[PDB]
């Protein structure tokens, strides 16, 4: 017999919206991003690694304190938060005053998908 | 200033296709499903948990041998493999002879999205 196939459309966005809920409730967040003001951001190591390798570099270079990765000086919540939110939604939420800094941050991470978006 | 927003369309499928590549290369696979013939299936614990809680129940009930979860008798590769592939793609690939068993398995997991698909 021949193998048949049926699908469920809009599964990508549906699956993505599920991971956003987990990110909102800090469910199964293995990676803890810790900023300069001791504020934390619980994320999924899989979601970030699927969008860039920059966070994988930080884990081998930056210091770790009690399961919390210390973010470098140029990589704080002003740029990290809206970029991570983009990974979970596909939407970049930002103020116009943050444009240049987000662009330079995107170049630093070499996040191509975010580079093209900012350079429309 | 007002917060602005730009987006990248088809991000859901794009992000989903990234996780499929990781699943193909066994990259960052934390959960190891071990079948009766000692065959293994490397999966992501996040992807499965986002589609059902059934695998979370197996981790608290079924035995674990060297980071490998022992699958129950009714839950083997004949049904597990095509169902997991659905989670990563949104497409259920199967033979017609497996229809009834996949349906009963879906009822057992209470995977609603797969139930409606099979009961079109």
- Assigned token pair, A95: 């103020």
| Residue written as token pair 């998908």 | A113
Resolution in A: 2.5
Q: How many domains are there within chain B?
A: 1
CA of A116 vs chain B CAs: smallest distance (Å): 10
Question: What's B95's domain CATH number?
Answer: 3.30.710.10
Q: Which residues contact A46 (CB under 8 A, 6 or more apart)?
A: B19, B22, B28, B44, B46, B47
Question: For residue A55, what are the β-bridge partners?
Answer: none
Q: How far apart are CA A114 and CA B24, in angstroms?
A: 25
Task: Report residue B83 as tokens.
Answer: 């169902």
The residues near B101 (Cβ < 8 Å, ≥ 6 apart) are B78, B79
Please name the residues in contact with A35: beta carbons below 8 A apart, sequence gap of 6 or more. A41, A71, A76, A77, A80
Q: What residues in chain B have their Cβ under 8 A from chain A's Cβ atoms?
A: 1-16, 18-19, 22, 28, 44-47, 49-51, 86-87, 89-97, 113, 117-118, 120
The rounded distance, in Å, linking the Cα atoms of A8 and B100 is 19
CB pairs under 8 A between A and B: 126
DSSP string, B84-102: HHHHHHSEEEE-GGGHHHH
Residue with tokens 């017609």: B96
End-to-end CA distance of chain B: 49
Q: Which residues from B are below 8 Å from A51, CB to CB?
A: 15, 18
Rg of the Cα trace of chain B? Answer: 16
Could you list the residue range(s) of the whole structural domain that residue B95 is in?
1-120
Check: CB of residue A74 under 8 Å from CB of residue A105: yes
Q: Which residues partner with A93 through β-bridges?
A: B5
């Amino acid at each position: 017999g021949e193998v048949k196939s049926v699908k469920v459309d809009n599964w990508g966005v549906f699956f993505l919206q599920k991971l956003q809920n987990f990110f909102n409730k800090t469910d199964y967040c293995d990676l803890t991003l810790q900023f300069r003001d001791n504020s934390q951001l619980k994320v999924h190591r899989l979601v970030l690694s699927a969008c860039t390798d920059y966070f994988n570099v930080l884990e081998q270079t930056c210091e770790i304190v009690d399961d919390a990765l210390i973010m470098p000086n140029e990589f704080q919540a002003d740029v990290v938060v809206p970029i991570v939110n983009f990974m979970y939604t596909g939407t970049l939420e930002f103020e116009l005053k943050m444009y240049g800094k987000l662009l330079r941050t995107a170049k630093e991470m070499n996040m191509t998908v975010l580079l093209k978006l900012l350079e429309a």
